[PDB]
Ligand binder design. Sequence first.
Ligand SMILES: [Zn+2]
Length: 195
Amino acid sequence: SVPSQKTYQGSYGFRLGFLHSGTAKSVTCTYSPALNKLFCQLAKTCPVQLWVDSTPPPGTRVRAMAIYKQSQHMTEVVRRCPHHERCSDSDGLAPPQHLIRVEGNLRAEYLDDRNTFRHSVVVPYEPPEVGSDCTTIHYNYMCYSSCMGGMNRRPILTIITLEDSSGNLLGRDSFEVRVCACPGRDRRTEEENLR
Ligand SMILES: [Zn+2]
């Protein structure tokens, strides 16, 4: 099977937000609204905002999962390549096989679905703090899109779901991701090719 990727704001008006980082050759993470695509460097911080019209119940959680964008690859579990899964770079919480990690959150949980075998990382949803209108989760992608034996140049989508305490769906959003050496240049290139 394959996880749904249908955008769903739900009862709480859930949707994602991205910073405006620009396309300088030195940028480490940049988002393209026109392509609904995040371009980022390997293992660098990717700030992702969570926006809601009303605060969901305590116990609400936020899960991140990657799936291949191409239908012919959709059933394949997105995982780190044979090289990176063995480079001993775990932060002591993320299993070395997981592509997506959450930075600086000791309550982050990493799941290996006993049924689908898919990987995901989930954290408790925290309402915005004083002075803020949104909540930010810092994600890391641990393989390049080009890693052989892994993503292998195949594009992926990250699906973010707002879930209740039982894991039931409250909201969903998604975006394409390309992990590369020069996000600024690749974003500029792809947006141009779009024109
Ligand atoms: Zn890799």
